[PDB]
mmCIF file of all heavy atoms in Angstrom:
data_model
loop_
_atom_site.group_PDB
_atom_site.id
_atom_site.type_symbol
_atom_site.label_atom_id
_atom_site.label_comp_id
_atom_site.label_asym_id
_atom_site.label_seq_id
_atom_site.Cartn_x
_atom_site.Cartn_y
_atom_site.Cartn_z
ATOM 1 N N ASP D 19 122.424 142.965 32.311
ATOM 2 C CA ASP D 19 123.554 143.850 32.226
ATOM 3 C C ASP D 19 124.448 143.571 31.102
ATOM 4 O O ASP D 19 125.502 144.269 30.931
ATOM 5 C CB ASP D 19 124.303 143.870 33.563
ATOM 6 C CG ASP D 19 124.903 142.566 33.957
ATOM 7 O OD1 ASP D 19 124.848 141.563 33.215
ATOM 8 O OD2 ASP D 19 125.507 142.533 35.099
ATOM 9 N N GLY D 20 124.245 142.553 30.219
ATOM 10 C CA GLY D 20 125.049 142.286 29.077
ATOM 11 C C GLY D 20 124.952 140.840 28.634
ATOM 12 O O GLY D 20 124.184 140.037 29.237
ATOM 13 N N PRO D 21 125.705 140.438 27.616
ATOM 14 C CA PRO D 21 125.582 139.136 27.017
ATOM 15 C C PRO D 21 125.926 137.983 27.947
ATOM 16 O O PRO D 21 125.340 136.904 27.802
ATOM 17 C CB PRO D 21 126.504 139.174 25.781
ATOM 18 C CG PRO D 21 126.702 140.604 25.489
ATOM 19 C CD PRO D 21 126.548 141.338 26.785
ATOM 20 N N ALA D 22 126.882 138.150 28.863
ATOM 21 C CA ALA D 22 127.154 136.982 29.742
ATOM 22 C C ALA D 22 125.931 136.669 30.581
ATOM 23 O O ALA D 22 125.593 135.520 30.761
ATOM 24 C CB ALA D 22 128.372 137.307 30.678
ATOM 25 N N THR D 23 125.259 137.682 31.070
ATOM 26 C CA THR D 23 124.008 137.482 31.819
ATOM 27 C C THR D 23 122.903 136.980 30.906
ATOM 28 O O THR D 23 122.101 136.114 31.307
ATOM 29 C CB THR D 23 123.611 138.712 32.578
ATOM 30 O OG1 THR D 23 124.687 139.011 33.436
ATOM 31 C CG2 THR D 23 122.326 138.510 33.350
ATOM 32 N N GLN D 24 122.801 137.429 29.657
ATOM 33 C CA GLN D 24 121.799 136.867 28.772
ATOM 34 C C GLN D 24 121.970 135.349 28.690
ATOM 35 O O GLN D 24 120.979 134.588 28.744
ATOM 36 C CB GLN D 24 121.903 137.349 27.343
ATOM 37 C CG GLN D 24 121.565 138.845 27.113
ATOM 38 C CD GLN D 24 121.789 139.194 25.673
ATOM 39 O OE1 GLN D 24 122.850 138.915 25.127
ATOM 40 N NE2 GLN D 24 120.809 139.858 25.078
ATOM 41 N N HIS D 25 123.232 134.892 28.495
ATOM 42 C CA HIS D 25 123.475 133.471 28.384
ATOM 43 C C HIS D 25 123.091 132.726 29.656
ATOM 44 O O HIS D 25 122.452 131.715 29.644
ATOM 45 C CB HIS D 25 124.982 133.247 28.079
ATOM 46 C CG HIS D 25 125.308 131.817 28.021
ATOM 47 N ND1 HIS D 25 124.838 131.029 26.992
ATOM 48 C CD2 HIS D 25 126.014 131.001 28.835
ATOM 49 C CE1 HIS D 25 125.276 129.782 27.170
ATOM 50 N NE2 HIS D 25 125.993 129.734 28.256
ATOM 51 N N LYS D 26 123.494 133.244 30.804
ATOM 52 C CA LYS D 26 123.158 132.609 32.100
ATOM 53 C C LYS D 26 121.697 132.573 32.313
ATOM 54 O O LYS D 26 121.147 131.571 32.844
ATOM 55 C CB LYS D 26 123.869 133.357 33.244
ATOM 56 C CG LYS D 26 125.407 133.120 33.234
ATOM 57 C CD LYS D 26 126.104 133.858 34.327
ATOM 58 C CE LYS D 26 127.611 133.615 34.281
ATOM 59 N NZ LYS D 26 127.888 132.134 34.206
ATOM 60 N N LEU D 27 120.933 133.586 31.945
ATOM 61 C CA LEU D 27 119.520 133.594 32.167
ATOM 62 C C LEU D 27 118.825 132.593 31.247
ATOM 63 O O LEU D 27 117.897 131.842 31.722
ATOM 64 C CB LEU D 27 118.917 135.019 31.886
ATOM 65 C CG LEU D 27 117.427 135.184 32.144
ATOM 66 C CD1 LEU D 27 116.997 134.644 33.504
ATOM 67 C CD2 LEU D 27 117.090 136.668 32.007
ATOM 68 N N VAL D 28 119.222 132.484 30.008
ATOM 69 C CA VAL D 28 118.633 131.463 29.154
ATOM 70 C C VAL D 28 118.989 130.051 29.717
ATOM 71 O O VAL D 28 118.123 129.175 29.723
ATOM 72 C CB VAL D 28 119.038 131.617 27.691
ATOM 73 C CG1 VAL D 28 118.474 130.447 26.832
ATOM 74 C CG2 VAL D 28 118.509 132.962 27.155
ATOM 75 N N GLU D 29 120.233 129.855 30.141
ATOM 76 C CA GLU D 29 120.663 128.568 30.729
ATOM 77 C C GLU D 29 119.820 128.220 31.918
ATOM 78 O O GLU D 29 119.420 127.068 32.163
ATOM 79 C CB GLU D 29 122.135 128.655 31.137
ATOM 80 C CG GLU D 29 122.798 127.469 31.860
ATOM 81 C CD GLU D 29 124.243 127.716 32.338
ATOM 82 O OE1 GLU D 29 124.488 128.721 33.079
ATOM 83 O OE2 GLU D 29 125.108 126.860 32.013
ATOM 84 N N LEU D 30 119.517 129.239 32.759
ATOM 85 C CA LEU D 30 118.687 129.026 33.946
ATOM 86 C C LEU D 30 117.269 128.685 33.551
ATOM 87 O O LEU D 30 116.670 127.672 34.014
ATOM 88 C CB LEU D 30 118.710 130.289 34.785
ATOM 89 C CG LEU D 30 117.784 130.304 35.963
ATOM 90 C CD1 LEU D 30 118.085 129.213 36.895
ATOM 91 C CD2 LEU D 30 117.949 131.641 36.654
ATOM 92 N N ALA D 31 116.683 129.440 32.593
ATOM 93 C CA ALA D 31 115.298 129.221 32.192
ATOM 94 C C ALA D 31 115.123 127.830 31.628
ATOM 95 O O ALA D 31 114.066 127.252 31.782
ATOM 96 C CB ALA D 31 114.854 130.288 31.214
ATOM 97 N N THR D 32 116.106 127.279 30.900
ATOM 98 C CA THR D 32 116.018 125.957 30.247
ATOM 99 C C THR D 32 116.767 124.895 30.978
ATOM 100 O O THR D 32 116.928 123.830 30.422
ATOM 101 C CB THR D 32 116.498 126.091 28.795
ATOM 102 O OG1 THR D 32 117.891 126.389 28.764
ATOM 103 C CG2 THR D 32 115.717 127.113 28.001
ATOM 104 N N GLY D 33 117.190 125.159 32.199
ATOM 105 C CA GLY D 33 118.054 124.239 32.948
ATOM 106 C C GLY D 33 117.381 123.241 33.838
ATOM 107 O O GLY D 33 118.072 122.520 34.570
ATOM 108 N N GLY D 34 116.074 123.139 33.764
ATOM 109 C CA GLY D 34 115.301 122.217 34.575
ATOM 110 C C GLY D 34 114.359 122.846 35.579
ATOM 111 O O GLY D 34 113.394 122.148 36.020
ATOM 112 N N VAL D 35 114.529 124.120 35.922
ATOM 113 C CA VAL D 35 113.653 124.752 36.903
ATOM 114 C C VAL D 35 112.187 124.728 36.499
ATOM 115 O O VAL D 35 111.323 124.683 37.370
ATOM 116 C CB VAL D 35 114.174 126.177 37.199
ATOM 117 C CG1 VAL D 35 113.992 127.122 35.989
ATOM 118 C CG2 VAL D 35 113.462 126.816 38.398
ATOM 119 N N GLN D 36 111.919 124.769 35.202
ATOM 120 C CA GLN D 36 110.520 124.754 34.768
ATOM 121 C C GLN D 36 110.159 123.510 33.978
ATOM 122 O O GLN D 36 109.221 123.551 33.221
ATOM 123 C CB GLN D 36 110.037 126.003 34.085
ATOM 124 C CG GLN D 36 110.815 126.341 32.839
ATOM 125 C CD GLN D 36 110.448 127.753 32.364
ATOM 126 O OE1 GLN D 36 111.335 128.536 31.939
ATOM 127 N NE2 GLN D 36 109.209 128.033 32.231
ATOM 128 N N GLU D 37 110.786 122.371 34.305
ATOM 129 C CA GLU D 37 110.390 121.124 33.711
ATOM 130 C C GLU D 37 108.866 120.944 33.928
ATOM 131 O O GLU D 37 108.149 120.446 33.070
ATOM 132 C CB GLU D 37 111.158 119.975 34.373
ATOM 133 C CG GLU D 37 110.624 118.590 34.064
ATOM 134 C CD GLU D 37 110.795 118.239 32.613
ATOM 135 O OE1 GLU D 37 111.513 118.898 31.845
ATOM 136 O OE2 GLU D 37 110.217 117.146 32.196
ATOM 137 N N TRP D 38 108.345 121.299 35.134
ATOM 138 C CA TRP D 38 106.921 121.091 35.424
ATOM 139 C C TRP D 38 105.978 121.750 34.466
ATOM 140 O O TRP D 38 104.831 121.298 34.253
ATOM 141 C CB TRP D 38 106.563 121.594 36.834
ATOM 142 C CG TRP D 38 106.760 123.081 37.036
ATOM 143 C CD1 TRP D 38 107.889 123.720 37.399
ATOM 144 C CD2 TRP D 38 105.745 124.077 36.852
ATOM 145 N NE1 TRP D 38 107.665 125.088 37.456
ATOM 146 C CE2 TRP D 38 106.376 125.347 37.132
ATOM 147 C CE3 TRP D 38 104.405 124.042 36.476
ATOM 148 C CZ2 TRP D 38 105.646 126.507 37.053
ATOM 149 C CZ3 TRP D 38 103.714 125.239 36.414
ATOM 150 C CH2 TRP D 38 104.315 126.486 36.731
ATOM 151 N N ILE D 39 106.388 122.834 33.776
ATOM 152 C CA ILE D 39 105.419 123.592 32.935
ATOM 153 C C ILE D 39 105.086 122.833 31.685
ATOM 154 O O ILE D 39 104.036 123.021 31.046
ATOM 155 C CB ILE D 39 105.973 124.984 32.567
ATOM 156 C CG1 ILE D 39 104.776 125.929 32.226
ATOM 157 C CG2 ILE D 39 106.997 124.947 31.450
ATOM 158 C CD1 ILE D 39 105.240 127.368 32.033
ATOM 159 N N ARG D 40 106.026 121.911 31.275
ATOM 160 C CA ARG D 40 105.868 121.330 29.933
ATOM 161 C C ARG D 40 104.574 120.574 29.735
ATOM 162 O O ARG D 40 104.058 120.643 28.625
ATOM 163 C CB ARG D 40 107.111 120.508 29.604
ATOM 164 C CG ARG D 40 108.416 121.241 29.742
ATOM 165 C CD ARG D 40 109.632 120.684 29.033
ATOM 166 N NE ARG D 40 109.832 119.299 29.481
ATOM 167 C CZ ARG D 40 109.363 118.230 28.877
ATOM 168 N NH1 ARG D 40 108.723 118.333 27.650
ATOM 169 N NH2 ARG D 40 109.572 117.040 29.457
ATOM 170 N N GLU D 41 104.066 119.913 30.789
ATOM 171 C CA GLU D 41 102.866 119.095 30.631
ATOM 172 C C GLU D 41 101.641 119.773 31.113
ATOM 173 O O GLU D 41 100.575 119.186 31.164
ATOM 174 C CB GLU D 41 103.059 117.791 31.387
ATOM 175 C CG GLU D 41 103.235 118.045 32.916
ATOM 176 C CD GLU D 41 103.298 116.834 33.800
ATOM 177 O OE1 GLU D 41 103.380 115.651 33.381
ATOM 178 O OE2 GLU D 41 103.231 117.050 35.050
ATOM 179 N N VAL D 42 101.680 121.027 31.508
ATOM 180 C CA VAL D 42 100.492 121.730 32.017
ATOM 181 C C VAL D 42 99.495 121.912 30.874
ATOM 182 O O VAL D 42 99.863 122.312 29.749
ATOM 183 C CB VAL D 42 101.085 123.035 32.558
ATOM 184 C CG1 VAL D 42 100.330 124.294 32.302
ATOM 185 C CG2 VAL D 42 101.498 122.741 34.056
ATOM 186 N N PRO D 43 98.199 121.713 31.127
ATOM 187 C CA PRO D 43 97.238 121.874 30.063
ATOM 188 C C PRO D 43 97.249 123.270 29.521
ATOM 189 O O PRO D 43 97.211 124.270 30.276
ATOM 190 C CB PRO D 43 95.855 121.506 30.692
ATOM 191 C CG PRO D 43 96.284 120.578 31.794
ATOM 192 C CD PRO D 43 97.639 121.092 32.355
ATOM 193 N N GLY D 44 97.284 123.411 28.190
ATOM 194 C CA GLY D 44 97.207 124.719 27.529
ATOM 195 C C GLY D 44 98.548 125.296 27.232
ATOM 196 O O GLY D 44 98.588 126.251 26.441
#
Side-chain angles (χ1 to χ4, degrees):
Chain D
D19 64 2
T23 302
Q24 292 177 311
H25 176 68
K26 290 179 180 308
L27 183 50
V28 176
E29 175 186 53
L30 174 58
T32 65
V35 66
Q36 59 189 138
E37 169 68 9
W38 63 272
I39 203 173
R40 306 197 307 94
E41 62 173 9
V42 138

